[PDB]
Amino acid sequence: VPETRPNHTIYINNLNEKIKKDELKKSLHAIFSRFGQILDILVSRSLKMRGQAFVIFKEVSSATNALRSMQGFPFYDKPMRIQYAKTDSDIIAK
RNA sequence: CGUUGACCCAGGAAACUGGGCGGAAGUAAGGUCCAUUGCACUCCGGGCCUGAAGCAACGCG
Ligand SMILES: NC(=O)CC[C@H](N)C(=O)O
Ligand SMILES: [Mg+2]
Ligand SMILES: [Mg+2]
Ligand SMILES: [Mg+2]
Ligand SMILES: [Mg+2]
Ligand SMILES: [Mg+2]
Ligand code: NA
Ligand code: NA
Ligand code: NA
Ligand code: NA
Ligand code: NA
């Protein structure tokens, strides 16, 4: 049941798991910095966290625009599925 | 691993202390086979193969 409550952070899944962590992070940044200031991008290839990423924007409006505009975009041959993060990210609790 | 140092962070009036920061390690990472659509921020699934680096220098291994 898709998370639709707006947030500073977007949650992305259905990411291609064969992409190297570093290259994935850099591609995500390239794709999303257009939408606004990104504080951070959290990427892990653990069993639990692979295929997934969190990109943290400074403004909520940036996250919203990023979410709406990049939905379903084919990224390393896989359509990105984007929702808002369920709860705030740490840096945003600061 | 040692020495003499550089830079960043926390604390300290300071001296400096603690990290970042070296043989680290069969680790991080990479290839493949299997498994996985998973809401995290304190790494981190399994097999086989491969496999690094402190910031500088010199010494040692
Ligand atoms: N990793 C290391 O311990 C490097 C040592 C090497 N002798 C050097 O001068 O850099
Ligand atoms: Mg001070
Ligand atoms: Mg010191
Ligand atoms: Mg030293
Ligand atoms: Mg050296
Ligand atoms: Mg020797
Ligand atoms: Na200080
Ligand atoms: Na004091
Ligand atoms: Na240090
Ligand atoms: Na691999
Ligand atoms: Na493997």
The closest alpha carbon to A80, from A68, A64, A89, belongs to: A68
- The CATH number covering residue A8 comes to 3.30.70.330
Name residue A72's beta-bridge partners. Answer: none
Please, is A9 exposed, middle or buried when counting C-beta atoms within 10 Å of its C-beta (0-12, 13-18, 19+)? buried
CB neighbourhood size of A53 (10 A): 22
**Structural domain harbouring A45:** 1-94
Distances (CA, A) of A82 to A5, A10, A67, A94: 12, 7, 6, 24
DSSP symbols for A18-71: TS-HHHHHHHHHHHHGGGS-EEEEEE--STTTTT-EEEEESSHHHHHHHHHHHT
Say what the alpha-carbon torsion angle A83, A84, A85, A86 is, to the nearest 10 degrees.
-90
By what method was this entry solved? X-ray
For residue A79, report the distance from its CA to the centre of ligand 6, in Å: 52
| Nearest nucleic acid nucleotide to A89, CA to C1' distance | B41
Please enumerate in sequence order all residues whose Cβ is within 8 A of that of A6, keeping only pairs 6 or more positions apart, or say none: A60, A63, A64, A84
Which nucleotides in chain B lie closer than 7 A to a protein CB? 29-32, 35-45
For residue A17, report the distance from its CA to the centre of ligand 5, in Å: 35
Counted domains in chain A:
1
> What resolution in angstrom units was achieved for this structure?
2.3
